[PDB]
Amino acid sequence: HMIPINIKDFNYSDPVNNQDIILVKNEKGSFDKGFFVADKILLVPARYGNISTDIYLETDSEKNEYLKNMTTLLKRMNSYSTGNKLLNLIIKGEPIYSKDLQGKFIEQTPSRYLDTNTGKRRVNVMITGPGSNVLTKKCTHNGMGLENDPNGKHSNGTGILSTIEFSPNYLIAYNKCVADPVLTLFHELVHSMHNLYGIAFPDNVKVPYNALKDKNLVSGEEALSEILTFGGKDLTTEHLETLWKKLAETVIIVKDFVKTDTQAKDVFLNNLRFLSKNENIKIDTIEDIVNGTLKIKNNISNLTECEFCKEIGDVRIRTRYAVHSEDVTPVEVVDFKNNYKLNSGFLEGQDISKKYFITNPP
């Protein structure tokens, strides 16, 4: 059942050691302290990009709080089968090597490595603070999103590390119900998992009509991976068959790419073993691929925000992924560390009227 993951506790003041406490080279060429809370999962208490607006996360005390609060979310997530399973995939995944102009494979690539003050370090996901908007929660690869990058490494089976922007102190309420940040963080990590294995498919699919959104039986469309990430009623058995199909196509394509190199091929096969939960997965024949990717679809079909929510049991999630922006209310969490707990979540629940939520923050 549960695969042990050691999620490490740090204080922001803990010295850089070049092992689990490092300095990440940022876009401006300065350095932010990074903490490997787990293998290949780097937590960076800093703002993302150049901030000139809302200053949050500049002080040591705020950096320490961010570190503690995000670690609480990760430990909570890891307490549940769904969360633990997701984090394992993220830890164990390996983006495929790239080919140079000679057709030779190279292992040390920007898809696999971040720059640090001591040089290149292997990262699968970097979790860091938001940009200029403190509310931003987003999973990027190479500075780009799910639908931003046609034929990107996030969607072509080769895979790429992600950066997640996320603040646990500034949140959104849907119809007076503040989204639980463990659910939102799980959401973003599902995106990072898809990116890591190069299975973040952008393909538009139709979603069920929503009476309190659509009109005159005109349904909406959304990206397949988005519907998969959220899950619930919006995700249909047909969506999942589209996913199975896309997976099989991807494996066929990637097989052809790595066929020239044993090491590169072995990495791919390792990935397939983790995704499929089958040590004996093969890609020798079309049939092997179809069977293998079926196991992959089944295995990742339960890694959805709705499934995670269900498993927690005592937290609320909105019914549909699609929201109209008239239902949304920003909030600030007061004294997160005392009001949101590892085993409990929000101590008095997610209603916006609770004292530890400030509506329409400064």
For residues 147 and 311, which CB has a smaller minimum distance to Zn ion in the complex? Answer: 147
For residues 225 and 276, which CB has a smaller minimum distance to Zn ion in the complex? Answer: 225
Min CB(230)–Zn ion separation in Å = 7
Identify the three-state secondary structure at position 170: strand
The rounded distance, in Å, linking the Cα atoms of 296 and 193 is 13
Min CB(252)–Zn ion separation in Å = 27
Min CB(147)–Zn ion separation in Å = 10
For residues 195 and 276, which CB has a smaller minimum distance to Zn ion in the complex? Answer: 195
For residues 170 and 257, which CB has a smaller minimum distance to Zn ion in the complex? Answer: 170
Min CB(305)–Zn ion separation in Å = 8
List of residues contacting Zn ion (CB under 5 A): 229
The rounded distance, in Å, linking the Cα atoms of 127 and 275 is 22
- CA neighbor of 295 nearest in space, from 315, 278, 317, 314: 278
The rounded distance, in Å, linking the Cα atoms of 286 and 252 is 8
* Residue 118 half-sphere exposure toward CB, CA atoms < 13 A: 12
Q: Are 361 and 330 in contact (CB under 8 A)?
A: yes
Q: Are 196 and 274 in contact (CB under 8 A)?
A: no
Min CB(324)–Zn ion separation in Å = 17
The rounded distance, in Å, linking the Cα atoms of 62 and 167 is 11
Min CB(179)–Zn ion separation in Å = 12
For residues 94 and 307, which CB has a smaller minimum distance to Zn ion in the complex? Answer: 307
Q: In whole angstroms, how far apart are CA 75 and each of 135, 245, 288, 331?
A: 22, 34, 37, 23
The rounded distance, in Å, linking the Cα atoms of 164 and 141 is 9
For residues 116 and 229, which CB has a smaller minimum distance to Zn ion in the complex? Answer: 229
